[PDB]
Amino acid sequence: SGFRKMAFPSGKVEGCMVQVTCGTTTLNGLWLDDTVYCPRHVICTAEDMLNPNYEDLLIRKSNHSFLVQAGNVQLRVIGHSMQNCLLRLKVDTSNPKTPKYKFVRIQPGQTFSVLACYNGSPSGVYQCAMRPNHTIKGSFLNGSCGSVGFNIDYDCVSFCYMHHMELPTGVHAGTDLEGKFYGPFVDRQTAQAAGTDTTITLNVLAWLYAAVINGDRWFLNRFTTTLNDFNLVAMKYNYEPLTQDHVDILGPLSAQTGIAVLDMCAALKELLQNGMNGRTILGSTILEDEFTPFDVVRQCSGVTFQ
Amino acid sequence: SGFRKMAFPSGKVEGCMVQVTCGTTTLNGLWLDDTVYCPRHVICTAEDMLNPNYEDLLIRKSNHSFLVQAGNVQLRVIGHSMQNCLLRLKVDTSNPKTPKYKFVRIQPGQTFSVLACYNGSPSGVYQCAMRPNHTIKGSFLNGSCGSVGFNIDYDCVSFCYMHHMELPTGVHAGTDLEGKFYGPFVDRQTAQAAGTDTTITLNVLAWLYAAVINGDRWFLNRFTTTLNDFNLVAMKYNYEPLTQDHVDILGPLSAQTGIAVLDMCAALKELLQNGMNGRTILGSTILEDEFTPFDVVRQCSGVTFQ
Numbered sequence: 001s002g003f004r005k006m007a008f009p010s011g012k013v014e015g016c017m018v019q020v021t022c023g024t025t026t027l028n029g030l031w032l033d034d035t036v037y038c039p040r041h042v043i044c045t046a047e048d049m050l051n052p053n054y055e056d057l058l059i060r061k062s063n064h065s066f067l068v069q070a071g072n073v074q075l076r077v078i079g080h081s082m083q084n085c086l087l088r089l090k091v092d093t094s095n096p097k098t099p100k101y102k103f104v105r106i107q108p109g110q111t112f113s114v115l116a117c118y119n120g121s122p123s124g125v126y127q128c129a130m131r132p133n134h135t136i137k138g139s140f141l142n143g144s145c146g147s148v149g150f151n152i153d154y155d156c157v158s159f160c161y162m163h164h165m166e167l168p169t170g171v172h173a174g175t176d177l178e179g180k181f182y183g184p185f186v187d188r189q190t191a192q193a194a195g196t197d198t199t200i201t202l203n204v205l206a207w208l209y210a211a212v213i214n215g216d217r218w219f220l221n222r223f224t225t226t227l228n229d230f231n232l233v234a235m236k237y238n239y240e241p242l243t244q245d246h247v248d249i250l251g252p253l254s255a256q257t258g259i260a261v262l263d264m265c266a267a268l269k270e271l272l273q274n275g276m277n278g279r280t281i282l283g284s285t286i287l288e289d290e291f292t293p294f295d296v297v298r299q300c301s302g303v304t305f306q
Numbered sequence: 307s308g309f310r311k312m313a314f315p316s317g318k319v320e321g322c323m324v325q326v327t328c329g330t331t332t333l334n335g336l337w338l339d340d341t342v343y344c345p346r347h348v349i350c351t352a353e354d355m356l357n358p359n360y361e362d363l364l365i366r367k368s369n370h371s372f373l374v375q376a377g378n379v380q381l382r383v384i385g386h387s388m389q390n391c392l393l394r395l396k397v398d399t400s401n402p403k404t405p406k407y408k409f410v411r412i413q414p415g416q417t418f419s420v421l422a423c424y425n426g427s428p429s430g431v432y433q434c435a436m437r438p439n440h441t442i443k444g445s446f447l448n449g450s451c452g453s454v455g456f457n458i459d460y461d462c463v464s465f466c467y468m469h470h471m472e473l474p475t476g477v478h479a480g481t482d483l484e485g486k487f488y489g490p491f492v493d494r495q496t497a498q499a500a501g502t503d504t505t506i507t508l509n510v511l512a513w514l515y516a517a518v519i520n521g522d523r524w525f526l527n528r529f530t531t532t533l534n535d536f537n538l539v540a541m542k543y544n545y546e547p548l549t550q551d552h553v554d555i556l557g558p559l560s561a562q563t564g565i566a567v568l569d570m571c572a573a574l575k576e577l578l579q580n581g582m583n584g585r586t587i588l589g590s591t592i593l594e595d596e597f598t599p600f601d602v603v604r605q606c607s608g609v610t611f612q
């Protein structure tokens with residue numbers, strides 16, 4: 001019993017973290033096989049963070065311009081290239097600790113674990129969701145660029161995020177492991193802002209199923225709704241529209257709890273309209289939107305507490 | 307910027323997790339040097355979970371009654387003993403991956419990371435606090451007994467919890483790594499209940515400092531309070547009393563933000579008395595009590611966003 005945001009155990013990714021230094025800049029990198037990946041802004045200098053031209057900043061770099069440090073050991077750089085907003089440095093050595101891994105591009109509303117690192121040294125791990133506005137609400141201080149986000153299935157690490165920037169509202173922006181940003185952001189210190197965000201409807205509904213699977217039914221009601229009517233109320237509250245795909249995704253949870261998805265929507269549409277005020281759901285006031293239906297299945301019992 | 311519950315990276319503890327089987331029971335253990343530690347209830351049988359006599363259940367066990375499995379490898383058991391509510395099994399082998407470690411007995415209000423494991427296989431990590439009523443609000447399903455809680459400073463793992471039981475309210479109970487329970491609980495399936503819990507005042511105040519360090523001042527006020535007057539209001543709301551020790555602990559945060567602790571108490575005493583209703587603090591409605599002043603210092607910037 002219990003329901004907690006939880007991260008994947010971080011050990012397979014700790015054995016991949018290194019420190020990359022170019023000049024007086026040090027930031028984190030990710031060593032997998034014989035390659036180190038890191039934000040290309042490692043090559044910026046203090047005086048040009050506004051409009052760096054990376055292609056031009058890089059052609060002035062050689063292999064011995066980069067030092068890669070793994071533990072107390074120095075990795076020799078034997079080639080480099082840029083890929084989108086990342087650099088790929090070839091090192092002497094293949095990392096004995098490389099796990100099975102994939103690189104994947106996570107989709108808004110999905111969740112992943114962040115391993116926050118400074119100077120190549122892991123300091124903490126936490127779960128977060130890719131927001132609909134393509135930023136994440138992370139927790140990162142100076143030196144965290146290069147920290148990665150990932151998910152793990154069986155023995156395989158699916159890397160999905162490398163950290164790059166913080167935006168004025170204190171939320172965070174970064175790229176996939178091919179160096180393509182999430183969202184419209186760019187790796188320069190020019191004014192950028194997160195676009196308005198929206199609540200992730202699919203996740204809020206999932207988390208209502210988890211509350212029920214765990215034993216709470218208080219927020220239910222005897223009413224049903226049309227997808228279309230629900231979506232009218234969602235607009236008003238700044239929720240993403242619910243699509244039939246989202247409804248189908250929620251099938252297994254609906255089946256385990258015996259509550260039809262559109263009955264759960266009417267319950268949400270009543271929480272939205274009438275408030276919670278006085279009562280929590282799984283320890284929370286505020287409808288929580290950072291758990292996927294997959295995260296609820298992974299973590300809850302397969303047997304409903306009826 | 308940002309503020310997130312975060313766990314310590316879990317890799318050093320993943321390399322310590324094994325599976326211990328006695329009969330048809332399998333649960334997790336913790337291998338450190340040449341010893342495996344696990345809940346003694348691994349020796350219970352289906353028909354006596356109410357009143358097992360462990361001393362008598364154990365004298366009927368030999369070394370070859372236990373199988374210890376590390377990865378695909380079998381560890382031979384070469385001696386065993388009981389210690390309080392744990393067994394210590396000596397294995398053939400010293401674990402090559404033992405980190406520097408200590409065993410410590412965490413104190414109520416402190417926080418630690420739990421690595422949830424099933425069958426010796428880590429599945430997730432999350433942060434939780436030792437509640438004043440000596441249970442933790444964890445998230446654990448059948449097979450999680452033996453999962454551990456820990457903190458890490460530098461290279462050293464301080465183990466503080468091994469999981470044993472779930473109580474009817476869905477909260478959790480367990481022991482230190484010397485096998486002494488936290489709280490008045492016992493390792494048998496006889497009726498037990500968590501005592502009434504209380505909110506952890508020191509942590510709520512810490513988290514008000516973190517909100518300020520991050521840049522929010524909304525809940526402040528022009529008023530001050532007496533420790534004693536604050537405590538009157540704390541009783542009414544079911545908060546632990548605030549002691550001068552707690553006040554001294556909060557000094558560094560007070561100094562970084564320039565808000566006197568007793569001014570922060572008056573602000574809390576006004577949140578308590580007037581509600582939050584409409585506004586959040588670091589993303590939360592509900593005053594959060596699962597971050598220590600040490601966890602806020604570890605995670606926030608050292609420079610206040612004034």
Ligand SMILES: *[C@@H](C(=O)N(CCC(N)=O)NC(=O)[C@H](Cc1ccccc1)NC(=O)[C@H](CC(C)C)NC(=O)OCc1ccccc1)[C@H](O)C(=O)OCC
Nearest residue numbers: 041140141142143144145164165166187188189190191192
């Ligand atoms: C890199 C690092 O630690 N971080 C993470 C910061 C954090 N708290 O998450 N990354 C950076 O600091 C960015 C460095 C940079 C990136 C591209 C090009 C040049 C430099 N910069 C920022 O994240 C910056 C804010 C910092 C807190 C100052 N963000 C923006 O400028 O966003 C755009 C913007 C919006 C509004 C007004 C102005 C700008 C680590 O710092 C490092 O090694 O840096 C080397 C460059």
Ligand SMILES: *[C@@H](C(=O)N(CCC(N)=O)NC(=O)[C@H](Cc1ccccc1)NC(=O)[C@H](CC(C)C)NC(=O)OCc1ccccc1)[C@H](O)C(=O)OCC
Nearest residue numbers: 347446447448449450451470471472493494495496497498
């Ligand atoms: C051990 C295991 O996975 N867990 C963790 C359970 C969880 N979800 O956290 N531990 C147990 O299940 C306990 C097993 C046990 C302990 C001592 C002696 C004999 C057996 N039992 C419980 O935790 C049990 C509840 C279970 C969900 C059934 N708790 C209590 O009975 O609490 C006291 C009580 C209160 C009110 C009424 C009755 C009892 C894993 O299950 C294993 O290997 O078990 C081997 C014994």
